Amino acid sequence: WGAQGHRLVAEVADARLNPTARAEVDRLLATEPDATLASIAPWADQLRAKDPGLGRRSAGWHYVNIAEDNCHYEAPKHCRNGNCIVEALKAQSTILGDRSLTDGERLQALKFVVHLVGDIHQPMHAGYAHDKGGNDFQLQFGNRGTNLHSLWDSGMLNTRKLDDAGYLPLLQSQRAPKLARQSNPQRDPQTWAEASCRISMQAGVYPATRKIGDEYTERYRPLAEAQLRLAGENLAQLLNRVLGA
Ligand SMILES: Nc1nc2c(ncn2[C@@H]2O[C@H](COP(=O)(O)O)[C@@H](O)[C@H]2O)c(=O)[nH]1
Ligand SMILES: [Zn+2]
Ligand SMILES: [Zn+2]
Ligand SMILES: [Zn+2]
C-alpha cells in the first residue's frame, strides 16, 4: 500500500488491541517521541527509499512472487536467504515478542510488523515475478497513466478523496471478515501471502483492456478496502498474541 493504506491498517488494529498489548505497544512507541501505530506504519517504505544499507537489504521484505507457482509458497524457491515478506514477517514477529531485547530493538520490529502485515494483504505484493508485482503492467486509469501495482497501492483508494478521519470509519462500517480463530505468527504469513496471491490471479484483476476507469474501481476498490480491514484485524490479532500476555 501507499502511506494512507498503511496508516489505515494500523488505525483499524490500534482500536482492537487488548489492554496488555496496548500497554506494551505504547511503551515501545514512547521510546520515540510522538510516534503512533499509524505514524510508524509507512516507515519501512521511507527506510527503503533513504537508507542505502538496511533500506536496500530490506527491499525484498515487502513482497513475494508466487503467482507463477499458482500461489503455493516454498521458502527455498521464492525466498532463499529469507529476503521476502513471508520470512521477514515471521522473523520480525519473533523479535517483537522477545522480552530479553531493548524497547528500541522491539520498536524497530514493531515498525516492520505493522508495515508487512499491511503489505502481505495487498494482492500485487504476492503476484508475478514476471511483471514485478504489476509494476511492469502499465495502464491508463481515467485520463492518467499508471501501473497495476500503483493502482492497488493507492490509485483506487485515492478515488475516495478521504483523509484517514473519513476513510477509517468507512473501513470500520464493513461487515466483520471471518478471521482465523487464533494467531500463529510462524504459519499465518504464508497463509496470508497465498490468499493475497489468489486475489492477484482472480478473473479481471489483470484487465483485458489497457484503458480502465469507473467499472474497474467499482468492482475492485471494495476488494482493496476489504483487504485493508482484514489486514487491520489480522495485525491486531497478531499484536494481541505476540504482546498480549
Ligand atoms: N510482488 C512484487 N512487488 C514488487 C516487485 N518489485 C517491487 N515490488 C513492489 O512494487 C512497489 C514499487 O516497487 P519499487 O519501484 O519501489 O522497487 C513496492 O510496493 C515494492 O514492494 C516484485 O518483483 N514483486
Ligand atoms: Zn505498502
Ligand atoms: Zn506496493
Ligand atoms: Zn512496503
Numbering used by the authors: 27 to 271
Show sentences the authors wrote.
The activity of SmNuc1 towards c‐di‐GMP in crystal resulted in a distinguished complex with the emerging product 5′‐GMP. This enzyme from an opportunistic pathogen relies on specific architecture enabling high performance under broad conditions, attractive for biotechnologies.
Purine nucleotide binding differs compared to pyrimidines, confirming the plasticity of the active site.
